[PDB]
A paper describes a structure:
The icosahedral capsid contains 60 copies of a protomeric unit composed of four proteins, VP1-4. Enteroviruses are unique in harbouring a lipid molecule (pocket factor) within a pocket in the VP1 β-barrel, which lies below the surface of a deep depression encircling each fivefold axis, termed the canyon. The binding of such receptors can trigger pocket factor release and viral expansion, leading to externalization of the N-terminus of VP1 followed by VP4 to form a pore in the endo/lysosome membrane through which the genome is thought to be subsequently released.
The previously internal N-terminus of VP1 now traverses the capsid from the region of RNA interaction, via the “off-axis” channel becoming disordered or cleaved beyond the last visible residue, 66. The A-particles showed no evidence of bound KRM1. The reduced occupancy of pocket factor in the complexed-virus particles and the presence of both unbound and expanded full particles suggests that receptor binding triggers pocket factor release, initiating the cascade of conformational changes that produces expanded A-particles. These A-particles are unable to bind receptor and are ready to uncoat by releasing the genome.
Author numbering:
A (entry chain C), C (entry chain C): 2 to 48
B (entry chain C): 2 to 172, 188 to 239
D (entry chain C): 97 to 172, 188 to 192
E (entry chain C): 145 to 172, 188 to 192
F (entry chain A), H (entry chain A): 66 to 210, 220 to 297
G (entry chain A): 150 to 210, 220 to 224
I (entry chain B): 14 to 251
Write the structure that this text describes.
Amino acid sequence: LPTELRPGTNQFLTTEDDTAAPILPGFSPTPSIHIPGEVRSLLELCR
Amino acid sequence: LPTELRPGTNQFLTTEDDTAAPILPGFSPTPSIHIPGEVRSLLELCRVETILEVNNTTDATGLNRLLIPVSAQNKADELCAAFMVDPGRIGPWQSTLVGQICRYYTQWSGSLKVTFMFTGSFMATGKMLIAYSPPGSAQPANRETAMLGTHVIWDFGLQSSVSLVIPWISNTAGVVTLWYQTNYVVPPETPGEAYIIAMGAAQDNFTLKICKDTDEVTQQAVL
Amino acid sequence: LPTELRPGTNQFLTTEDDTAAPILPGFSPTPSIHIPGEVRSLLELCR
Amino acid sequence: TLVGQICRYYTQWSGSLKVTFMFTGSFMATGKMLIAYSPPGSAQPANRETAMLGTHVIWDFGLQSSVSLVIPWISNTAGVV
Amino acid sequence: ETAMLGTHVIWDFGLQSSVSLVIPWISNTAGVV
Amino acid sequence: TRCVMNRNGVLEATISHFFSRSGLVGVVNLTDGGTDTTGYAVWDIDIMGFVQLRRKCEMFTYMRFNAEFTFVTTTENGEARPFMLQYMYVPPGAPKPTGRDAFQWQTATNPSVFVKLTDPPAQVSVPFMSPASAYQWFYDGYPTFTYGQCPNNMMGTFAVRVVSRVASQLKLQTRVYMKLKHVRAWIPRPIRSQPYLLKNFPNYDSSKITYSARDRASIKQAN
Amino acid sequence: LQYMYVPPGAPKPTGRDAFQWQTATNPSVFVKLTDPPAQVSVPFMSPASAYQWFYDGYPTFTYGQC
Amino acid sequence: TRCVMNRNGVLEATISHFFSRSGLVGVVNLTDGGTDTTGYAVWDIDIMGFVQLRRKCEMFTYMRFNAEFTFVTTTENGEARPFMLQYMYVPPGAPKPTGRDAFQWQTATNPSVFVKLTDPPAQVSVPFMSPASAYQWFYDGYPTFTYGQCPNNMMGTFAVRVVSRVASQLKLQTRVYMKLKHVRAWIPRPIRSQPYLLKNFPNYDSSKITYSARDRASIKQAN
Amino acid sequence: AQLTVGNSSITTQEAANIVLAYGEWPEYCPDTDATAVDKPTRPDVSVNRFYTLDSKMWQENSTGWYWKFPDVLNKTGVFGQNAQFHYLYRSGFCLHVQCNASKFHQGALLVAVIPEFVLAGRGSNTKPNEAPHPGFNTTFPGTAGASFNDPYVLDSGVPLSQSLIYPHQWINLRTNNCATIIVPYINAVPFDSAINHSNFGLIVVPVSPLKYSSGATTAIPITVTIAPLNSEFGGLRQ
């Protein structure tokens, strides 16, 4: 598959949203539980 | 097709899972056969009963390190032996596959099974108290304060191979103690000095997490 | 389209099977004919 | 032999072989040869007798000229004929 | 050893006392036990 | 006391994940000069070199997998300069390179890969190359139609050089890192506790016999 | 270069050429310096369901260390 | 005795896989200077150059395939420096370049490819260029309307230079590697046993006639 | 009870408390190219008989004993005759180990099968030309079977305490004086040499030393009986 590059390669935007290699593959984190006092947006605090 | 790159190119993660060019294309390996004794996870090993090096001392040199002595020359209502329940610790578990495999991992959790085996005469008879004291406590002083917790009795004069289920453990730890509920009853003409074997393994509910290498192997390499 | 590279780039495996740019595009080779005495595998010779 | 030549072009081979023999004398002549195969892991036979006690054939080339033989197995000392 | 390679039985008389055995044939040197 | 109560998942416990996380097994040095060196280097493919996974490999007997090798390089100094190398794999039963410019390097059946040194490290995928259905880390019995050398564990070897007729005055130290794909084990073995003495043979010192569990004061005192 | 991550409860490298760098369970990533910077993704590594920025109470079976 | 019993697969035995595994056939040297050299180099496309696949190619008579050439380069020293080269292919029946800056390099019908030397080696795909349905490695009979020269086996040639009007004081050794795609053979031939004497003609020494099988003591002693 | 096979007959207790090594029964070799080209012989008539080796004398200071299969049978009857005259071999085994002791003896023995059991070259001297390998007599003891020297390490550099992942069984002089294992063919290649490669090896070790009173028997007799299963031979060499 032939391709080309364009400007924007090899740069590191502090704002951009991209993945990265998960260095602990197959890993299993500790599952979550229904912790009361959750939030989803700071607007909840501002009121 | 125009594209762009992003950070993460040309790097070599020792952990990442990726393919590579198969340098022998079209190759045909030797096909597999139904080899008995297969495995699929080390947990299968961790639920197998191995022996504990419970007699850990400087005075026992060989197999004697694995045998709990018992005699009628000891009195009743006294402590015979005891140990901790801590596989990945410096104690009489490092001889056990559970402890060995815990050394290969950071955090474990679950329930365990500790069994004991007696080997004396058929005619002999006694009664041992097998008392477990959960962590956050001290090992019992006497038999009485131990009887007030998760304990079993064991009249090895009748039933030899005894077992026990420790409910929980994770990562001080719980203790297991063996007391003379009675004296070693003995008929005439028998030495009246026997040995108890202590075996241990993990139950199904056990689980392991992040892997780490071990320390007991002090050698970097050999060649 | 943002992407990343991985180890194995710019290398030349003497074994790998890949295409290359056909430098004579649209070219028309001489067509084949039913030449007797064909083969498809050296095992035919070994018997 | 092309089998040997082509084996030189590869590491591991396996299977069964066919060895044949052809006689060329007179039509009127006649004899009898023993063609004895001794599988590997053994020594070539000392005499005809210890060879007759294994995979063998006879061959009265006075009647039947072009004789054949099938060696069962080989892979990669070896068998003897 | 050379006896174990023929018609033989074992007998752990610690458990089973009265043991038997069947000799197959005889007529009229003879067999040994 | 952060006594966890939550069952963790079982995916790290699989042999697959127990032989993942590519690590190193071999480091070689390659200096190029005149008639006072070799200008090339040869390394036989080995597993039991570094004793951390030799312990994890003897934990079973029979194994079968595919290899994923990665060759990284640098100067002993550390700098990365634009030179073109040549790695070549050699399958078993094939002559190894004896000299820099010898003919084996120009061999076709021998596979090879050409890279720049300013190129990211190279990757390759070796398949299961044994004649047998599996590798045997233990072959009690002579291979003769000096003892215990497995007739089939040689994956082959590797050879490294630079591609030039000039003696490029260069000193490199090449590190390899090996990943295992699609492992399948069989017949678990108990883990070795004694330090090694030499490769490929499981000898041991019958005098400085180490004990698996360290020593405490008595048996009636846990801690 | 060589960056290596070390999970908790594991010995840290004491020297340049010490043995911990040659460790497998310790993950690591090798890059060129003329290579764009490296990226990695750490997952939630706590034993607990969450991190606690405040743990009033001694961790003993010197104060407040989570 | 590792006497294997398992039938292995037949995919390596195919002519396809017997002419795969791209290898080299040609190495050229290119030095650039003033009026004491050429500054360029020409190499006619050849097959029977290196005698390992000449044996594999005479194993049949008539063949048809597509070529996959890869041009790798370096300095005789070994270093890779940022210079722009020019490879050009020349089809048969076309004039070859006589000088560095001669006009043939500026030719359109002649295809060419421009790369950096710090660029990974170049690849190209030549199709079947014979007038005939296949190549003939043997053409007993004069081509006249000095003997046996096949009228159609010339794939063409190649020419290499750097792109500059300055005499860049540079000494390169270029290696080519050739892969064969979609081979189709015909009429197998027996393998030649005698060493060669000169190219393109299957002569042989009628005095030092080598024997295919070496010599033993008798016929009644195998070994 | 009693078990009679071929011409041999050995009595024991009634028991289905018997271990299957890795949970599979023995079985003949399925279709391979060897199974396709020729029929390797399937003797099932007389080679299958409960062979009874020489008794062993367990004492107060005994280390333990072991054997090597099929090397223990390489010179024993018709089976040995088939073993040294066929370079292809395959089989399973029924190992019935008995001890004959009174109720006044104490001591505990461990029965275990080990595949690819490799003995260790003791006498540490790191040297290529020295290489103190164990000799032919030791690594291939043959019929009698040798003893141990360092049981806590199994004379193999491997701790005994973890040796229970192996198919094992306890012999306690109180509860039972007998035990039995069944082991199938354990090798990474269907056939092999019966004479220069042992597939596995039995071990018996006193994990609780024998003890007794004044006037008792000082040596416990331990016997082992063995019966092959579904064996197969190939390639009659002379």
